[PDB]
Amino acid sequence: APKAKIVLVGSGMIGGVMATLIVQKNLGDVVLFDIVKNMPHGKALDTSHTNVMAYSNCKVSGSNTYDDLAGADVVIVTAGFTRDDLLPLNNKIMIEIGGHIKKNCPNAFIIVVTNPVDVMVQLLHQHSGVPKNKIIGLGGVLDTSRLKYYISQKLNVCPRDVNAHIVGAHGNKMVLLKRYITVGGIPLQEFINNKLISDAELEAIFDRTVNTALEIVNLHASPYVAPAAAIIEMAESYLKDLKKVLICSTLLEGQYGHSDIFGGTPVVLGANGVEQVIELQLNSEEKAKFDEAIAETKRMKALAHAH
Amino acid sequence: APKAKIVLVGSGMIGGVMATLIVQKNLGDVVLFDIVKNMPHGKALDTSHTNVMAYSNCKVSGSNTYDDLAGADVVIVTAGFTRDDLLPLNNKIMIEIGGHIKKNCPNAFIIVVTNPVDVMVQLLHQHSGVPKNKIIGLGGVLDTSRLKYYISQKLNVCPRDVNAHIVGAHGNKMVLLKRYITVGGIPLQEFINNKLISDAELEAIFDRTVNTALEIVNLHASPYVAPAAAIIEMAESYLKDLKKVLICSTLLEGQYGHSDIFGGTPVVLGANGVEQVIELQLNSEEKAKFDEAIAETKRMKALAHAH
Amino acid sequence: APKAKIVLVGSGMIGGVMATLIVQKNLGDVVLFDIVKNMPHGKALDTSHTNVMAYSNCKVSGSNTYDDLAGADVVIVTAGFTRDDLLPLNNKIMIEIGGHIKKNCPNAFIIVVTNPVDVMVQLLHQHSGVPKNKIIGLGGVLDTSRLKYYISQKLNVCPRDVNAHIVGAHGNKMVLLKRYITVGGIPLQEFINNKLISDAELEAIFDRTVNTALEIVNLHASPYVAPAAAIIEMAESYLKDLKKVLICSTLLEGQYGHSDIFGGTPVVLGANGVEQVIELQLNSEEKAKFDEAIAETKRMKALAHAH
Amino acid sequence: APKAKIVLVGSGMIGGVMATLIVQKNLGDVVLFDIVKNMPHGKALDTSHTNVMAYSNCKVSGSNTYDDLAGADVVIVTAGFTRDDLLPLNNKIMIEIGGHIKKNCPNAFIIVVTNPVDVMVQLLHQHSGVPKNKIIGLGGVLDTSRLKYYISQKLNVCPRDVNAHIVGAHGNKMVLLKRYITVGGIPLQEFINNKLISDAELEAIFDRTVNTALEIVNLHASPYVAPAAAIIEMAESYLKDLKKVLICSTLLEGQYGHSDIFGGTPVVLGANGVEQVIELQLNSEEKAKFDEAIAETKRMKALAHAH
Numbered sequence A, B, C, D: 001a002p003k004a005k006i007v008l009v010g011s012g013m014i015g016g017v018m019a020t021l022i023v024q025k026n027l028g029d030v031v032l033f034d035i036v037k038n039m040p041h042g043k044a045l046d047t048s049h050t051n052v053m054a055y056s057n058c059k060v061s062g063s064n065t066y067d068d069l070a071g072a073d074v075v076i077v078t079a080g081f082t083r084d085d086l087l088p089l090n091n092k093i094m095i096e097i098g099g100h101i102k103k104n105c106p107n108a109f110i111i112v113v114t115n116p117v118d119v120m121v122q123l124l125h126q127h128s129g130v131p132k133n134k135i136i137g138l139g140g141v142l143d144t145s146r147l148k149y150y151i152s153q154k155l156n157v158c159p160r161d162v163n164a165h166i167v168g169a170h171g172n173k174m175v176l177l178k179r180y181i182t183v184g185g186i187p188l189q190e191f192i193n194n195k196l197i198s199d200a201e202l203e204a205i206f207d208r209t210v211n212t213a214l215e216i217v218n219l220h221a222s223p224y225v226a227p228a229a230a231i232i233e234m235a236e237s238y239l240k241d242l243k244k245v246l247i248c249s250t251l252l253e254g255q256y257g258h259s260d261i262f263g264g265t266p267v268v269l270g271a272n273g274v275e276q277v278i279e280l281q282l283n284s285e286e287k288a289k290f291d292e293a294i295a296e297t298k299r300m301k302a303l304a305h306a307h
């Protein structure tokens, strides 16, 4: 059938929530791929029964065979070891997966999750051969969900009604752009002026946003639900030609003064993949922060090449 | 049952789409009220069958009896004649409906649609006795849907990703605030700077927005689908405690320099009705336009009182 | 874009609700076609604004040009005059539309609504040249929505949890199969045995079901909301490859003893159109009723050919 | 706010999917309760960010404090050790939780998951003091999702279009009622007669259904996604007054010849909790199987009382 085929390369915790959400949303058939024997088949079987509760009709299958990438419309990569020593190990995984994408599904739209995402997405771009508009990395949708959510709780408004931009890279050098925050489309500064939220409060929210993964890990949990939902928002925009503006890691070709590297910026996602790369008109102080993010991606990319 | 009861006072074209959408969304039981015999019962019966297709369970009943307002959680008023000569006639309808609200459902949340809305909502406020946080008028959600949509089509982005503010009043004096337009939370001016949309294009879109009802009437149609969807977005925010920021007509108590009048401004809608009135920090030129909108509402309110 | 294109041939009341529902469900781009000037453009414009409220991205355009059928994935025909004298007039409309389908969109999936549907669907099948699996008529989903709904109200259960079969033809000779009614998958007879609903009650519900269109017309309304929702359930099953079992008019090739005629029977609708025709194992008494339905379709088909 | 408060007593794998699904569906505020320190707060924080992606507004909080049951509208119990030796241990947990329900939320609707469910639900009923219509156990929705799904895959129909009844108890003595299976509301026997599925195939599907939890465990996974979706279907029916017919464990008062015990049977779930208990008109052979299921529940209930 013309139902979409979505292959999850990596069947860990994020993969499991993704399969669940795909079925809830009836988005397409799902392959849970992993090199681990049996497990993806088990998760696939459990998930498949939810078609009944959800009134959906998506096949959910497990796989240890890379050739099941054939016919994929979307491929979502979470596979990888989870420190700089892991970089060359995860490069080798991106190499392996990229060769299989080129062979089996060169026209697939690819979303990379493996950290550090801004590095790993470019490695997979290089090894898979796919066009620049057909591969992105997770970052900004996830990072801004935290910022938007925390502000919405202070202001007692619907979370989605807060909008915000975090750019450059996923990770500790993410650039939180105070000037680009709105509430119901209104500049956040109006709310600061009105003493509904203070500058000091926002500073604390910014730090919390940057450190959220660490906060969750120290609570004896770890982030997989919100990462999964962010990825599925991205995949859905592609599959349904929604043309949502979503911040993702993408190949820069001069934007922000940078080329020959991936970084986080708003893009438009629809049926042609990355339909538009939107370059924020950053001031010099914001650009300097963007530059630090890119420098760190470059540092790690260099370590990834050889053991 | 604790299912919400939603009474549509007026069972014309907007009422018919509202009942349809309530069932699609399983939002509550529906009464289609009208003074017209038989017709509301017919529309109610037709609509009721869609529970099957929608997997919903909402009762849909017709009514010619005002006492069926008893137990209403939400009351949506579209009743009215459709020029200044109609003002005193529609005031008498608001009086009649207000007396029935006070008697039967004083705790209901009230949405007024009857034009001119900014006048009629205040008349109903006065005659119904309901608290200021429990009655609003349709305006800005509908008017901004046009502006957002037209810009989204030029920019090839998801319509909801354009945000915009139109304030003061529904109608020909609506205030379109160019400074408060964003695309993916980014100021529209960045897109103008980048020559993705021009100032001249936006001027044409502004005029189209103001004249949209007329454009549709001259096409041998008339607006009822988008008005209905806007109203249901508002009602839904209340019923589900979404706390969405939505522009509606509400009692001003000093905002923008105005008191003892209703006008269009962003508000937050949740379980307590109007939870917050948001006052945009308008500059003097924008305030002058706001003042013209209010002056027109006042002119018409004065004509409404006596035949 | 690979977004589906859905052309509504006929932009009357059913067409207007269909366009609304397509946007709510983000199912595809919509053309409201009619021979009436201006009106489809007006309805299209009104409807298009609801993309904002619905978080959808479907184009909604009006058209007086048949060549806009090009590229259609789904075509829904409601055009027609609304008595036997109309039969040859509506045949000529089916001829005209069929020629345009063959030319512009021979691979489209076609849903016919024009009454009498079981006749008009076959005429369009003949004139369009499309495969037997790619054209169906509205009937059973709509007629059974009434029966299911009325029983659900008596039994105080979710409407969708009542299932029921009405076959043969849409219209006054529809065959209501008492033996094929279930409630939560349980035979209705168990509920009769338990005195939760009586045989006399069901007889009254059967008559009400057959006469529902007339009941609504006499209430100074007419059925368009539930017909629209039924059609969109069918179209959605096709577009999303849901493989729902839905009763529709389809070409019979021996089922029930009948060939070379369309009639109402459960079918499975997915990406290949009619994937399966399900033949109920009717007893002789039920078959006799089926035969009467077919005889009436044949009588009218013969009158349709010439003025 | 009148937003529902849903307390998940137990924040393990099923609890985590439940919180995710509640947010996706905007069903209410969520407390993830556990005796484990920190972890529920971590899962709560991760999940809370999905309000943004989902356009929802549900609070998600963690808790180690039983008094946070106050104000709960729905309480879902998954807490428990996971063999007969565990029975007295899990009884003590039900005792503890029941005392806290009686004190803090005596009017809450309670769903029990802890295995063996048909025993543990009755123990919690006894210790909590809640009315018989306000507490149910998970079983039949989950078990029948497997049966429905497996048949739908053989017949190439939408999974939800297969209906089926499994009664008596959750667990290895579940009663699979071949006579009560339908496909699009049609008796499955018609499909057997037509050689679309054989008796031997159905026997294999029956065994697979009974052993599904074991099949998933042996695949180096374990069932939590489909159990969570089943529970949320039940909770949703209550919260939204859907009046769905759903098979759950409930207090029997003579049905099937049994009293003073809980067992699996179709019930109707709406705003008043268990609105109707539906007693299938089982034949003597089916009743004998039902009796074996009840006997096993009784055996285990007796072991639960003392260490």
Ligand SMILES: COC(O)C1CC(Cl)CCC1NC(O)C(O)O
Pocket (backbone or CB within 6 Å): A009, A010, A011, A033, A034, A035, A079, A080, A081, A092, A093, A096
């Ligand atoms: C740690 O290894 C993985 O998790 C993994 C997962 C996938 Cl989905 C593919 C390949 C993977 N690994 C390798 O190819 C490898 O070189 O170890």
Ligand SMILES: COC(O)C1CC(Cl)CCC1NC(O)C(O)O
Pocket (backbone or CB within 6 Å): B009, B010, B011, B033, B034, B035, B079, B080, B081, B092, B093, B096
């Ligand atoms: C033109 O009259 C109406 O449409 C109408 C509608 C409702 Cl729903 C109530 C009262 C109404 N009218 C009056 O009370 C009236 O004074 O005419």
Ligand SMILES: COC(O)C1CC(Cl)CCC1NC(O)C(O)O
Pocket (backbone or CB within 6 Å): C009, C010, C011, C033, C034, C035, C079, C080, C081, C092, C093, C096
């Ligand atoms: C009564 O005429 C119609 O409503 C109509 C509608 C469409 Cl959509 C096509 C053709 C139509 N008519 C004709 O072709 C005609 O022969 O009159």
Ligand SMILES: COC(O)C1CC(Cl)CCC1NC(O)C(O)O
Pocket (backbone or CB within 6 Å): D009, D010, D011, D033, D034, D035, D079, D080, D081, D092, D093, D096
């Ligand atoms: C194994 O213990 C649990 O998992 C547990 C969970 C909850 Cl949510 C409450 C009480 C619990 N336990 C006890 O009260 C206990 O007696 O151990």
